[PDB]
Amino acid sequence: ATFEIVNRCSYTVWAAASKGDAALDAGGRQLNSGESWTINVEPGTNGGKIWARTDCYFDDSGSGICKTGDCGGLLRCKRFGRPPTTLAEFSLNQYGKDYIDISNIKGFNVPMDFSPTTRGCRGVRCAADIVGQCPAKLKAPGGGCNDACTVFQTSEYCCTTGKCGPTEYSRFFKRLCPDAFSYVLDKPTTVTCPGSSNYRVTFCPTA
């Protein structure tokens, strides 16, 4: 499956793509404002994620640091990134279908649209200005908006026991971005696509 990753932000981002225990494709790359990076993701990829990282410095060997989304200080990510990170999430060829969604469960750093480029389903979008409206206690001093689990580490926010409900914090994400997951047991906003669809992830999809 091809994913075209497009940076429409006015700032540089460093895209990242991982399934948690491995990179997808090169796993990471700098995208200046306007650039596009097409990756190939193996069919059957389960629990893949794509995200953006901001204000990064990498040296010549591709080690450094990112203010949001850092995945162990590597340009080429092999694991998931440090919150806050808006997440494009997908599982491909799962009993004949693809599954896609956007999640705010690990916070928000950059707006995003995640859409198929082939026929038979709709995309999802989380493009509101969540960083600017972020509640005080969720603001990440390093940039972005943390989820409440990251900030407070309680069973209710982390949904440790499997029984949580919506909270004042998760309702903030859901009000700004109704089509993204706002907490673990949120009513699914996952989109079912034909197996083997292709996709575009766009950072900052709107002016």
From Swiss-Prot:
GO terms for cellular component: cytoplasmic vesicle. It comes from the Eukaryota. Keywords: Cytoplasmic vesicle, Disulfide bond, Signal, Taste-modifying protein. The keyword Disulfide bond applies. Transmembrane segments: none annotated. The keyword Transcription does not apply. Its main location: cytoplasm. CDD domains: TLP-P. Belongs to the thaumatin family. This is Thaumatin I. It comes from Thaumatococcus daniellii (Katemfe).
